[PDB]
Design a protein around this nucleic acid. Structure first.
Ligand SMILES: Nc1ncnc2c1ncn2[C@@H]1O[C@H](COP(=O)(O)OP(=O)(O)O)[C@@H](O)[C@H]1O
Lengths: 687, 596
DNA sequence: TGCATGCATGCATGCATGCATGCATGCATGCATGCATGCATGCATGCATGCATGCATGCATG
DNA sequence: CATGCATGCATGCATGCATGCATGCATGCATGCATGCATGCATGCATGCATGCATGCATGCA
């Protein structure tokens, strides 16, 4: 009964060689990870990051200089779960322990482990005194002390954590080895044979839960024998235990009666979410599935919902089956444990490094004529509309704010509407804008109702929260909106509530919340039946009241005059699209969006300040606008009224225009550009 | 599928089984002979088991680990080595068991002190075979015929005794009405069977203390090992001490014990059982063939048997000849004609009479010293069985029964009562014993050779009064005994001188070479009478009737039957096939000194 | 007198609200079963009383 | 005065009885264990209400 199997996997010399690689590494002053371990011993960091490349670099290094190394990349790659603690107990062999005197305000966790380090040694110092005092080289005298005393386990006092990291193909491109762990694989590609492996998946973060502590081990005070009982739980649920389980309360008539304790237990950060399929490699008639991923420890609070992320980890089952009668006997429900996060579309306001950044940013700066180059680069796949692209470049900036303090804020947001139909292909840009921009949700007219894009209340799974909508999702980002003309009339009311910032009021059956939203609005509606009748007026061919048009600072019109000379360049434009896969030729090179947004995000941290001469230039220029707008008062081609919100925008615009100079140099040509985009945006209906 | 542990014990022992090629030719000769055994049985017309002796020598000089593991926990190393050995049997061309021969001072302890220690180990125990049970076969594989479907079936049964490992017991009821309802008609013959036996072993009485209650254990045998021992011998047993059974913890002491996986070795006693296991090399027999080419070796063998005794030349000559035993020719549908020779001596005390007796015992083979009385079971078996298994009557073989093909040493023959002397006429002449009590009348065979020793009636008066009635024995007992030696009390000084330096050098070619030369002559040296053997003894025996009766008495034709035996045994010594006249010239002189 | 435009009204497409329905689980009740006790039975084992054997004696023998 | 025979007595062993001592058969008695049900918790289906929209009708205009 119960036979045994030998396998080529060893645990002995692998533990020996993994000690040497943990010690002997010099390439990337002294040893790399010991200085990191001294930084861990500095008690200022909680994570340990292990690559696979320096392993493979070492594995290249040992064969070329010495006889033979045991393979260790594919060794970890197979089972990958026993390599957690068998690696980590070798770390505690070597440690620069007293490297800094403890701070009084360091950590309440730190003062507890310092006790259990010291209480271990003082208990160790007692037993070696009694044995030498009762005699009848001292290694066996040391060894007698080792087994006659109950101690705290070394698993109980750790204070740090370790996360693995998958290898890139880049070093695998030089020397091909077991690079199977890092491929963009699908949930459909997850066959049930990849259990225990280390994988790489990607998708969309959907229905993120909340972070709440997970109990791991529980302390138990005796109060009679004075020991501490410890119970490790790896199940879903558990039980409290009996009255005592001491060795000294044992073999005695009166046992104790215990109770647990809070401050001595060890907890863990816990939160999970679900990943939906990428919706690009899905077969032609299928519906995307989901997958459960547990997240533990340091990496928590790092995954916003509705993103694109590369998740790598190791693939483990959970003991669970479905309904009671449907159980075929051994039903294994799986999950994935998160190990490393690499996000596509790297989020702004999260970097501070500038040196390797300005290694490429200064080359963009020293390229010359940058501001005209930018709007050429965002969605260049149409012809013309450069001033139209120029304003949308400025929509990408935004990024200004001011509160007077004990008062009100001002919203530094731009709201550009688009009018015209149909051969301008506006939706080619509408998909392009929310694609490059981080936190970009593409929305339609009817597919969200008045309750859809706002929040909702449903029963919480395992961890009655407010499940939010798209505008709840796409805060601090830009919402792309199709066909505002066909919304619900109640859905119009919420949009007016965004033009005053952060306001979403709810007076439903049990909900009285006023939730906040740092969103941004782009809208595009179509004109009336027919197309551009000069017999029709402004607001005659418009299906919306002008109070909503007063809330729009910037408005465009998409004319289509069939002109003879404008076609031949546009004909050569569109035919060149299908000849190749790139439009510009010998005059321009496009900016890739990843390098583009980093220059944007660095420009988002400037906050230019105005001056006094630019104060003088704007005031009389507003008297220019206020005087000639109020001399018509008609339903003619000119619009009716000029708001003070027009001045609120154009001050904010030249402020945002100063941000692309990155210099806090609000000047005369700063404002000179701002007036040009006002008079051309309006009244382009002359031809 | 086996684990890594099981194959490693195989490949390590396979490394040893490939190390020494001596056992390779052993199993080769096993297979070739049994192939040739079936070849002659199946070609003109139109036995041996499977076990090989392995010593406990080579394992210490090969693997001290595998040495140690056997000697403590044998239940892990015995199965894979046999599986590896059955591999060798199948690869070079059924259990294929082993021996584990070998002397070790580890666990050769008494069974008296064996209990509660060294359990689940391999122990070598010796002692006395007693109360042998009955031989029963064991059912293994049942065969069943179904009538309507017309096919056979298959069914096995196992027990915990054989397997040596505690496996989950799965009993199965003997089958009837298996699938649909056809009658499972039973068959036989093709159903296989294996014999079975259990015995008890008492410890050694020579090793035992003075007087205490003896305690014993039990041994169950196996297929090729059923019935090698009669009750009443000295046998070494090598096996594994195993305790089975649920020791009373089910619902006052359980855990009864036994020993299985056994090899049986009968060993020679002082006065019981066979000692003829002595080997003969080609180097040995070449010395015998060099020895037998001489002309005076009968003298040297005569002088050899008095290592510490002066004189008695012609007495020693016959002691060669009794161990020769003469020739036996049973007649065609008649009776046997007795071939052995029985001698009584007489003489004054302290004249090497008791210095002869154990020399006759120890040098010979299968001898029993019978002293004083011989009452109620020496010549008999007495049939006293109160066997608890069934009301029946069996026998316990007495010494005269037990000493068949051997020598009976009778001490102080005159003190025997007339009761057993009735049986001596039956034993010495008809060579049979018939016991007829009310349970079962019986008849058995015993053709023992007899030497007895009686004293004179009164004083040392061996020559003074008269040669007749110095013994006052019954008349037929004169006719029973062949030669009657009279030892005198001759007082001299030259004779005293030969006594003098003999005993002095005493307190300040060989025997083991001798018994090799003896037992070789039994199975190949019987001779046949020739024409020259008639002409002397016809002339001579008439002189024995015409003139010896003018001196002494008696002369029967039975005396002439001894004249055949003396020339017979003399030809055995020279290992001739014919019979020479010189053999009679020796035999004629032997009567003159014995009588006149 | 015929026609385009604004106003009143029914329709059924999504949110609250009510209830029927399906599944997990700890406990009180009934029944198969081991265990103590004495019996009829079957079979081995000790024992004491009278006869043949050994020795002393009277008689005869030479 | 030195042996042989008939006579009488003392004594150890064979065994057919009485009695104690191992397996099955039977019966009364008390401990423990599988399990269906009352209860509670989670979930899907159907109706009234708010209403944008299509439609019929009143209206002034060329
Ligand atoms: N011829 C002899 N040579 C040597 N020793 C002798 C001889 N005769 C007698 N003995 C001695 O006699 C002793 C044996 O006495 P034995 O006659 O056998 O006993 P019993 O006469 O009582 O049967 C032995 O110890 C032996 O030493």
């Amino acid at each position: 009964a119960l036979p045994s199997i030998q396998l080529p996997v060893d645990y002995n010399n692998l533990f020996n060689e993994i000690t040497d690689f943990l010690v002997t590494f010099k390439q990337d002053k002294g040893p790399k990870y010991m200085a990191m371990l001294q930084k861990v011993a500095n008690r200022e960091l909680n994570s340990v990051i292990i690559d696979l490349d320096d392993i493979l670099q070492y594995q290249n290094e040992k064969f070329l200089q010495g006889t033979q190394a045991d393979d260790l990349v594919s060794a970890i790659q197979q089972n990958a779960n026993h390599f957690t603690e068998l690696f980590c107990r070798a770390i505690d062999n070597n440690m620069p322990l007293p490297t800094k005197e403890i701070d009084y305000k360091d950590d309440v966790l730190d003062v507890i482990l310092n006790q259990r380090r010291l209480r271990n040694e003082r208990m160790l110092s007692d037993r070696t005194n009694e044995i030498r005092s009762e005699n009848l080289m001292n290694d066996a005298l040391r060894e007698v002390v080792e087994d006659e005393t109950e101690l705290f386990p070394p698993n109980l006092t750790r204070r740090y954590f370790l996360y693995f990291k998958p290898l890139s193909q880049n070093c695998a491109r030089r020397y091909r080895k077991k690079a199977i762990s890092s491929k963009p694989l699908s949930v459909r590609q997850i066959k049930g044979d990849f259990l225990g492996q280390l994988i790489t998946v990607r998708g969309i973060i959907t229905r993120v839960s909340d972070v709440k502590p997970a109990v791991e081990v529980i302390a138990y005070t005796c109060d009679q024998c004075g020991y501490e009982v410890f119970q490790e739980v790896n199940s879903r649920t558990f039980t409290p235990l009996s009255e005592c389980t001491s060795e000294e309360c044992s073999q005695n008539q009166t046992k104790g009666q215990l109770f647990m304790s809070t401050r001595a237990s060890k907890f863990s950060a816990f939160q999970e979410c679900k990943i939906q399929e990428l919706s690009q490699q899905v077969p032609v008639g299928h519906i995307p599935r989901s997958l459960n991923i547990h997240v533990n420890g340091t990496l928590v609070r790092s995954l916003s919902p509705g993103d694109i992320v590369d998740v790598t980890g190791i693939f483990l089952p959970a003991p669970y089956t479905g309904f009671k009668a449907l159980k075929a006997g051994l039903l294994t429900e799986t999950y994935l444990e998160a190990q490393f996060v690499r996000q596509h579309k790297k989020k702004f306001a999260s970097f501070s490094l500038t040196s390797d950044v300005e290694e490429r940013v200064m080359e963009l700066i020293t390229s010359g004529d940058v501001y005209n180059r930018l709007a050429k680069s965002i969605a260049p796949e149409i012809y013309g509309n450069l001033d139209v692209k120029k304003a949308l470049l400025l929509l990408l900036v935004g990024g200004v704010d001011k509160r007077v303090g004990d008062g009100m804020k001002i919203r530094g947001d731009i709201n550009v509407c688009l009018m015209g139909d149909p051969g301008v292909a506006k939706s080619q840009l509408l998909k392009a804008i929310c694609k490059i921009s981080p936190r970009g949700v593409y929305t339609t007219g009817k597919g969200s109702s008045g309750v859809g894009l706002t929040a909702a209340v449903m029963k919480d799974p395992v961890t009655m929260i407010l499940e939010g909508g798209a505008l709840v999702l796409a805060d601090n980002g830009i919402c792309c909106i199709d066909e505002f003309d066909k919304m619900d009339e109640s859905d119009r009311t919420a949009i007016h509530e965004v033009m005053e910032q952060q306001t979403i009021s709810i007076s439903k059956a049990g909900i009285n919340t006023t939730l906040n939203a740092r969103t941004s609005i782009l809208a595009a509606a179509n004109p009336l039946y027919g197309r551009y009748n000069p017999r029709l007026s402004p607001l005659d061919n418009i299906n919306l009241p002008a109070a909503l048009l007063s809330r729009f600072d910037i408005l465009f019109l998409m004319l289509d005059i069939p002109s003879r000379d404008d076609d031949e360049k546009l004909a050569e434009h569109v035919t060149y699209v299908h000849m190749h896969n790139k439009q510009p030729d010998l005059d321009f090179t496009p900016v890739e969006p990843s390098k583009m947004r980093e220059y944007i995000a660095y420009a988002k941290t400037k906050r230019p300040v105005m001056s006094e001469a630019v104060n003088d230039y704007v005031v009389q220029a507003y008297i220019r606008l206020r005087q000639d707008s109020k001399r018509e008062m008609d339903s003619k081609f000119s619009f009716g009224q000029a708001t003070p919100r027009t001045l609120l925008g154009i001050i904010r615009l030249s402020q945002a225009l100063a941000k692309l100079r990155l210099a806090d140099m609000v000047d005369i040509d700063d404002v000179e550009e701002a007036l040009r985009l006002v008079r051309v945006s309006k009244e382009s209906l002359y031809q | 599928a086996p684990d890594a542990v099981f194959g490693d014990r195989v490949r390590r022992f396979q490394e040893f089984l490939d190390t020494f090629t001596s056992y390779r030719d052993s199993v080769r000769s096993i297979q070739v002979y049994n192939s040739n055994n079936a070849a002659n049985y199946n070609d003109d017309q139109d036995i041996l088991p499977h076990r090989i002796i392995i010593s406990l020598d080579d394992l210490r000089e090969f693997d001290r680990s595998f040495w140690s593991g056997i000697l403590v926990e044998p239940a892990y190393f015995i199965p894979p080595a046999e599986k590896a050995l059955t591999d060798l049997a199948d690869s070079m061309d059924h259990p294929w068991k082993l021996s584990f021969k070998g002397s070790f001072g580890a666990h050769a302890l008494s069974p008296r002190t064996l209990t509660a220690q060294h359990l689940n180990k391999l122990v070598s125990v010796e002692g006395i075979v007693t109360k042998t049970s009955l031989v029963r076969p064991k059912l293994i594989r049942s065969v069943h015929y179904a009538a309507k479907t017309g096919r056979f079936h298959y069914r096995d049964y196992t027990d915990a005794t054989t397997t040596l490992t505690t496996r989950i017991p799965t009993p199965a009821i003997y089958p009837t009405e298996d699938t649909e309802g056809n009658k499972l008609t039973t068959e036989y013959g093709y159903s296989t069977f294996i014999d079975h036996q259990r015995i008890t072993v008492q410890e050694m009485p020579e090793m035992a203390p003075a007087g205490q209650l003896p305690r014993s254990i039990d041994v169950i045998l196996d297929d090729d090992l059923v019935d090698k021992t009669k009750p009443g011998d000295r046998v070494n047993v090598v096996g594994v001490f195993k305790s089975l059974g649920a020791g009373g913890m089910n619902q006052l002491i359980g855990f009864k014990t036994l020993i299985l996986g056994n090899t049986v070795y009968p060993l020679h006693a002082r006065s019981t059982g066979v000692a003829a296991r002595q080997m003969l090399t080609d180097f040995d027999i070449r010395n015998i063939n060099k020895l037998s080419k001489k002309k005076d070796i009968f003298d040297i063998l005569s002088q050899s048997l008095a290592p510490s005794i002066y004189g008695h030349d012609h007495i020693k000559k016959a002691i060669l000849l009794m161990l020769m035993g003469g020739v036996e020719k049973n007649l065609e549908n008649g009776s046997h004609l007795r071939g052995d020779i029985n001698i009584l001596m007489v003489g004054d005390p302290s004249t090497a009479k008791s210095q002869l007796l154990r020399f006759v015992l120890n040098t010979a083979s299968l001898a029993i010293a019978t002293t004083g009385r011989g009452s109620s079971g020496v010549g008999l078996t007495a049939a006293v069985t109160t066997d608890r298994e069934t009301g029946e009557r069996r026998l316990e073989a007495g010494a005269m029964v037990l000493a068949d093909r051997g020598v009976v040493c009778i001490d102080e023959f005159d003190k025997m009562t007339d009761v057993d002397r009735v049986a001596i006429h039956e034993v010495m002449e008809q060579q049979t014993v018939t016991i007829a009590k009310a349970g079962i009348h019986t008849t058995l065979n015993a053709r023992c050779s007899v030497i007895a020793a009686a004293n004179p009636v009164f004083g040392q008066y061996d020559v003074n009064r008269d040669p007749h009635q110095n013994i006052a024995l019954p008349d037929s007992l004169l006719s029973r005994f062949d030669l009657l030696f009279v030892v005198t009390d001759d007082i001299n000084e030259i004779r005293d001188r030969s006594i003098s330096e003999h005993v002095l050098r005493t307190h300040r070619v060989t025997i083991p070479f001798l018994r090799k030369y003896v037992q070789y002559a039994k199975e190949r040296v019987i001779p046949q009478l020739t024409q020259e053997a008639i002409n002397v003894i016809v002339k001579n025996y008439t002189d024995l009737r015409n003139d010896d009766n003018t001196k002494k008495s008696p002369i029967t034709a039975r005396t002439l039957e001894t004249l055949i035996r003396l020339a017979t045994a003399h030809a055995k010594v020279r290992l001739s096939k014919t019979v020479n006249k010189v053999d009679a010239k020796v035999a004629a002189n032997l009567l003159r000194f014995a009588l006149l």
